[PDB]
Design a protein around this motif. Structure first.
Motif: not given
Lengths: 148, 49
Positions: A4-8, A36-37, A65-71
């Motif tokens: 799981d890769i979170a995004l800012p 994290t990213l 799968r990409v989501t504006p929240h996580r990756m």
């Protein structure tokens, strides 16, 4: 096992472009589930040999799968030999059926992803057939050996 | 004649320090123990850790 890769918070004009990245591989340093990213980051072009050596210490991971929240990303190879998955062909050459593929750093430093929302760029490598990756590696090591 | 001053342990302050037990078969025991078990609380964390 899906990392799981979170995004800012990024710009709405950049998630529309990063979402178009669904088959390029990333290079993580460790394999904890949550991640994290900011950790996975690479500068722009330079010293193709350094990156080629770094491509052996770090292990790959394909994103699906990409989501504006996580990756959500897939640990490519640590324990699995049948995880049939899809990755896009960001290579110059054309790959037919029954071809072993190889990840090679990009050339000239021309193609990267300058993400201004957080001031960091990710240099996703290119996928070439083995037969041409071998000649590329050979040419580069010959040129490096040439300069004493 | 000096009479003795009888003092009993139950009326002192140190009574509240230890719980006492009339165990008549103590001399019969081999190595004897007591058992514990505790659970330390845990706090959730918003973390890539």
């Amino acid at each position: 096992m899906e990392v799981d890769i979170a995004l800012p918070t990024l710009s709405p004009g950049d998630l529309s472009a990063l979402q178009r990245c669904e088959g390029r591989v990333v290079f993580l340093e460790t394999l904890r589930r949550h991640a994290t990213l900011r950790e996975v980051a690479l500068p722009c072009g330079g010293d193709v040999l350094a990156a080629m050596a770094a491509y052996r210490r770090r292990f790959a991971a394909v994103i699906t799968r990409v989501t504006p929240h996580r990756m959500l990303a897939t640990p490519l190879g640590v324990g699995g030999r049948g995880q049939s998955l899809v990755l896009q062909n960001t290579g110059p050459f054309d790959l037919t059926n029954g071809d072993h593929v190889c990840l090679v750093p990009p050339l000239l430093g021309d193609e990267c992803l300058r993400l201004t929302s957080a001031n960091l760029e990710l240099r996703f490598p290119m996928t070439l057939p083995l037969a041409q990756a071998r000649e590329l590696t050979a040419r580069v090591v010959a040129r490096a050996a040439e300069t004493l | 004649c000096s009479t003795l001053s009888l003092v009993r342990f139950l009326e002192l302050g140190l009574s509240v320090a230890c719980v006492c037990t009339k165990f008549p078969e103590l001399s019969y025991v081999a190595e004897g123990t007591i058992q514990f078990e505790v659970q330390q609380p845990m706090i959730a964390r918003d973390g890539p850790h």
